[PDB]
Symmetry: C5
Subunit: 307 residues, 5 copies
C-alpha cells in the first residue's frame, strides 16, 4: 500500500466567477513515492521532461494518475517532469492552471468571506495512500493586498482523509476507500471599492430623496418624487453594469430596494397629507415634520437589517 | 449481442444557456461488459490509465465508442481508465464535462420548470445492448439549494429504449435498431431574486404610475406621465442589462408592456377628461375617481393573464 | 472516376451571427464508395472506429478528404468510423459541429428570411464524383417552433454540380472540374418577441410623443419635447442593449430615427406657432389642430416606407 | 538556392478588432518547388493528404516551414496535402484561418480606410527564395457590398522583397537575408449605418439643443439645459454601448464633446444674459438673437474641424 | 555546468487585463548551448523543424525545458526549430504568444505607468546556467505611438540572477539555486482619450452643476439639483460601460464621487439658506455669493487631492 507525499505550490488564486462558483488556481504539484531501485546514468538522479515521460510509461514506469476532484474541466498542464532516483524514489512535478469549484455564498456582498479549495485524490487506487500534504502559499499575508481584490486570512489549511464510495461495482472485500488530500484557503473581499463607489453614493441618493418634504407645494412634492424614482432606476442600471450577476439578493441589492421603498412611501405620505383634511385642500403640514422623522424611520428599518 | 451496463455520476449541472437551449454537465461515465478472459499480472485485475488505453486498442481490445447523442460539440474528457478483469470483464471509467442540448421553454420566466437530459447510444453497434442504466445524483435534494440557481425535483429518472433509424443505407435484414439510455432530471428556477429585485420594483413603479390622477392640474397630470413613460423605459433598460436574452416574451417581459400600456392609457384619459366637456375647460373631474378605480381595472386585466 | 454517395443528417442549426454572417450546424456526415473487395473477419463487415481509422490509412486505405467549402475554421469532429465491407464498399460516418458562412441580408429585421447552406467538395480530386446527395432534416416543420428562434420553410434542398477553377497550376488536359454538393435550408425569424417587446412600445412612445400638442402653454409644449427627446435616446439605449449589432440600418433602426424626426419636427412647429403671428405672442393655435393631423402625416410617411 | 512559387486564395477578411488591431483571414495557401524526381505509383502524380504528410517528412521529404510573420497566434490549419510529381516538383496546399496584425488608424471613424495585410516568410531559410507571388481575391468588387461591413478598394497588391536581420548569431558570411512575400488589400468602412443611426440623430439633438433660446423665461432657459445635458450623456451611453472601444478620439467622439460644449456654452450665455444689465433683472434679450446666430457659431467651429 | 545564451524578440505587448493583472506577448525565443560535436549531412549545420525535433529527443538529444515562470497558462507555441551545428552547438528557436502576469497598480488611472515583465528559468536544472540575455524590442520609441494604447519608456531592461528555493526535497549538498533571466519593459498609458472624452466632460458637468445658485427661486434651486444628481448617475453609467473594471478606486472614480459630493453639498446649502432666517422665508441670499465661492471651495479640495 504505496506511500505518496504531496506538495502543492499555489501561485495565484484569481478570476472568481460568482455565477458558476469557480476560481482559478495557477501553481505546481509534486508527488514523491519510492519504487524498486534503478540504474541511473551517472549515479545522479535522472531527469525526464515532458514528452519523454510518456515514453517511460510505455516501458512500464507506473506513474499514478492523480485527479483534481473539484476541478471544472481538464486543467492546463505546463511543464512536467519525472526525477528518477537510483535508490528507487520518484518525484513528479508539474505546473498547472486549473479552474476549480467550491460552494460560495455571496449573500452578504462586498462583505463576503470565502474559501478557496483544492481536492486531490488518485484516480484508480486506494492502497496507494497519500502520506503527507504540504502547501506553500507564495503570496504572503500583507504584501500589498490593497492592489489585490481579496485578502487571504490565515495560511493554507490541510486535511488528508479517506473517502468511501458506496456505489462501486465489482469489488466487495473492503476496497472502496480512497485517499484524499484537501486544501483550503480562507479569504475576504476587498470591501473598499464598493463602499466608496456604491454604498456611499447610494446613501447620498437615498438621503437627498428625503429632502422632498422640504418642498413647499404639494404639486412640487409629488412631481419630484417621480424624478427621485427615475434616479433610483438610473442607479440600478449603474449597479447592474458593474456588479457580478447572481441568483440571489446581495446587501447592495437590498439597499436598492430600500430606495424604491422610501420613494414609494413618500408618494403615499405626500398624497395622504393633501387629502387627509376636514376641509378640502388643508395639507396636513404637521406630517411634514416627517421632514427629519422618517429618515430615522428608515435608519430604524436599516438597523433592523443587521440580524 | 453484447451486454453493457452503464453507470453515470452527475456532479454539477450548471451554466444554462437560455438562447441556445444548453446546459453543462460535469460527471463520470462507467461502462462494464464481459469479454473473453485474460491473463492479468498477479491475478488481480489490471489498471490501464489514459494514454495506455489506446495502446490496448491497437492490439485489438475492442472498446466501443458510446456517443452522447444530445451533446453540442465534443466534450472535455478527463482521466479515463480501463479496468481489465482476468475473468473477462472490462470496466471503462471516464470523467467528463460536456455541453448538452434539450428543449427549453422559458415563457413563464422566473417561474419556469425545466428538464436536464442526457442521451447515450453507441456509435456503431445495435447488437451490443445497453443492459441496465444507473444514475447517481451526488447533489442531494435540500443541501442548501438557496445558494444554487435551480432546485432539482426528484431523483434522476431513466429509460433504456430502442431507436429505429429509417434512412440507413447498406443494411436490410432487420438491423437498424440501436440501444439508447436516456437520463432526465427535473428542476425549477429559484424564483427569489426575480421577485425581490424585479417583479416587486416593477410593481411599485406601475403603482406609483397611478398616482398621476391625484395631481390637481391638467398640465400637471399630462406632463408627469412623460416622466412616468421615461421611468418604464429606464426600467426596461435595467431588465435588459440583467435578464437572459430570449426570442419570446417572458412574464416579466409582459409586465413591462403593461407598464407602457397603463401609462399610455393614462395619457388618453387625462387628455379626454380635459376636452370631454360642453363648455370649454371643464375637467371631467368625475373621471378622476378612476384615481383608485383603474388600478383595479389593471388588477382585473392582471388576474386575467393567469388563465 | 469514383462514385461517392453522400448523406448528411442535420441536428440543430443554431447560433446565428449577424455581424460575421455565420451559423452553427451539428449533424452527421456519411460517404459511401466501393473499393476492391476485402477479407473481413467473419464475413460480416468491419467496424473501424476513431483512432483506428488513421491506422488503416497508413496501410494504404484511401479515404478521401471531403472539405466543407464554406466552413469558417476547422469543425469539431466527433466520433468517426469506417464500415469496411467484404465486397469492397466503404462507408464513412462522422458526427460534426461546424460554423458555416453564407450571405445574410438582415435589412428587414425581425422580418428577415434566411438561407442556411452547406457546401461539400472533395479537397484533392475531380474524377472522384459525388454520386447522389441526401439530407435528412431531423427537426420537423411544426414540432413546437414557437420555442425556437427560427421557423424553417420547406425541407432541405439539394444540387450536385461541377465547379471549374480557372487559376490552378500544373494541369491543362481538362482536369480543373471538381464535384460539389450544395445543401440549402430556408428559414424565417420568429418575429414575435420583437413585435411585442420592441415594435409596439416604440409605437406607444412615438404616439404619446404626439400628445405634446394637447398642452396648453408654449413653454409647456417646448419643454416637454426635450423630455420626449430623452425618451427616444433612452429607448435607443434599450434596443442597442438587446439587438444584434449590424453595419446597416434595420427596420426597427429606422422607426427609431422616425422618433427622433417627429420629435424634432414638433420642436420646429411648436416654435414656429409661437412666432408666426401678426402681433407678438399670438400662438397660431390653428396649427394645433395638427393635434391629430400630423400623427397621420406620419402614418402617411410610414405607409410610404413599405417599398 | 530553391525557387518557391506561392499562390494565396483569400476567402473572407472578417472580424476586425479595433482595440487589438487585428483581422481574420480564411483562405488557402499554395507552394510549389521542384525536387529530385521520384517514382510515383502509376506515373500520375501522388496525392498525400493530412496525417500522411508527416509520414513523408520522417522519410526525409523536406517540406519547408513558411511562417505567417504578422499572425497573432498559431492559425487554424484545415486540410493540407502534398501533390508529389514524378518529375520532381511538389505542391503544398492547405486551407487556413488565421488572425492577423497590422497597424490600424481609426481616428477618422466611420470614414476610415484600412489595409488588410499578409506577411509570409520561411521560418529557417534564406537560400530558398520566394519565386513569384499570386493572390486570388474570390470576393469581387461590387458583388453586393452593402451587406458587407467593408468595401475593398482595388485587387490584391503584392511585393516580394528581401529582409535583413541584423542581430542573428552564428552566421557572418552574408547569410542574414530572408525572402518575404507581403500581400496588401485596401478597404473602406461602410459609413452608412453610422450616418443614418449616429451622425444624424446626434445632430438633431445638437440642433434642438439650440432651441433653448426660444424659451421666454430665464428660469425656463437655465432649467432645460440641464435636461439637454442629461440628453447628451444619455446619447453618450448609447454610442458607448454600440461603438468599438478605442484609445483615441474618433470623429463621433468629438461630435459628442461638441454637444457637451454647446450646452455648457448656453449655460454661460443664459446666465450672463440675466446678470449683464443696466438695472437688475434686465435680460439682455438682444443676446437672444443668438437664437439663430450661435448655431452658425457652431457650424463655423464645425467647418474648422475638417482641415 | 552548461552555458546557455538566450535572445528574446518581442513583437507586440498587447491586450492588458486590468482585473487579472495580465498582458499578452508575442515574440520569439532563442537558446544556444554547445554540445559534443556531430556529423551533419554536408558539413553545413542541420535544420530540424517542428515535429522532427521531438524525434531527436527520443534519440537522446537533450534539449532543456525552459519555463516562463510568470506566464498564466501554457503559451501558444508556433514554429520551433533546432539548428544543429557540426562543432557541437545547438540553437533552439521558437515563436510564441503567451499571457503573462505582473503586479499592476491602476490607482492613478489614465495616468498610470506600468511594467511589462518576462521571467525565464529552466524547469529542472541549476547547473545549466543562463550565460547572457538579449532582448530585441522591434517596436521602436516614436514609430507612431498615438495609434497605440501605450507608450513604452526606455529600451528593454535585463538581469540574470540566481534564485534559491528553500522548500525543495531530496537535495542538500548546495543544489537549490536556479538561473533566472528577467526582462522588464516600462510603459505609460496614452492619457489622451480619457482626458478628451472623460475628464473633460465630467468637469463640464461638475461646473454646470454649480450654476444652480444662479437660479432665483428656492423651489427652482432644490428641484434642479435632483436633475443634476440624475446627471451624475447617468455619467457614472457611461464611465462604467467604458472603463476597465477594477477592485479599487481610480482617479476618474473619485472625480465621480466629488460630483455626487458637490451636488449633495448644494442640497444642504440650498435647504439651509431657505430656513436660516430671522423671520420665516428670508432666503439667506448672502450665502448665494457662494455662486462663485464654492466652485473654488472645490478647486481647493481638488488641489488637495494631488498628494
Ligand atoms: Na448598458
Amino acid at each position: 500500500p504505496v506511500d505518496v507525499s504531496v506538495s502543492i505550490f499555489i501561485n495565484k488564486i484569481y478570476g472568481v466567477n460568482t455565477l458558476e462558483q469557480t476560481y482559478k488556481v495557477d501553481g505546481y504539484i509534486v508527488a514523491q513515492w519510492t519504487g524498486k531501485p534503478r540504474k541511473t546514468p551517472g549515479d545522479k538522479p535522472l531527469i525526464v521532461e515532458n514528452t519523454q515521460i510518456e515514453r517511460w510509461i510505455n516501458n512500464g514506469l507506473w506513474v499514478p494518475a492523480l485527479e483534481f476532484i473539484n476541478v471544472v474541466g481538464s486543467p492546463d498542464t505546463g511543464n512536467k517532469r519525472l526525477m528518477l532516483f537510483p535508490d528507487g524514489r520518484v518525484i513528479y512535478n508539474a505546473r498547472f492552471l486549473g479552474s476549480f469549484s467550491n460552494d460560495m455564498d455571496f449573500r452578504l456582498f462586498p462583505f463576503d468571506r470565502q474559501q478557496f479549495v483544492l481536492e486531490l485524490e488518485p484516480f484508480s487506487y486506494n492502497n496507494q495512500q497519500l502520506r503527507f500534504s504540504d502547501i506553500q502559499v507564495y503570496t504572503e499575508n500583507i504584501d500589498n493586498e490593497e492592489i489585490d481584490e481579496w485578502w487571504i486570512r490565515g495560511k493554507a489549511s490541510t486535511h488528508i482523509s479517506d473517502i468511501r464510495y458506496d456505489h462501486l461495482s465489482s469489488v466487495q472485500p473492503n476496497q472502496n476507500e480512497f485517499s484524499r488530500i484537501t486544501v483550503r484557503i480562507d479569504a475576504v473581499r476587498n470591501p473598499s471599492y464598493y463602499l466608496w463607489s456604491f454604498i456611499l453614493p447610494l446613501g447620498l441618493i437615498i438621503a437627498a430623496s428625503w429632502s422632498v418634504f422640504w418642498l413647499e407645494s404639494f404639486s412640487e412634492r409629488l412631481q419630484t418624487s417621480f424624478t427621485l424614482m427615475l434616479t433610483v432606476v438610473a442607479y440600478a442600471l449603474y449597479t447592474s453594469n458593474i456588479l457580478p450577476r447572481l441568483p440571489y439578493t446581495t446587501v447592495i441589492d437590498q439597499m436598492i430596494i430600500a430606495g424604491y421603498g422610501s420613494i414609494f412611501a413618500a408618494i403615499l405620505l405626500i398624497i395622504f397629507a393633501h387629502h387627509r383634511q376636514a376641509n378640502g385642500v388643508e395639507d396636513d403640514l404637521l406630517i411634514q415634520r416627517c421632514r427629519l422623522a422618517f429618515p430615522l424611520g428608515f435608519l430604524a428599518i436599516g438597523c433592523v437589517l443587521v440580524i
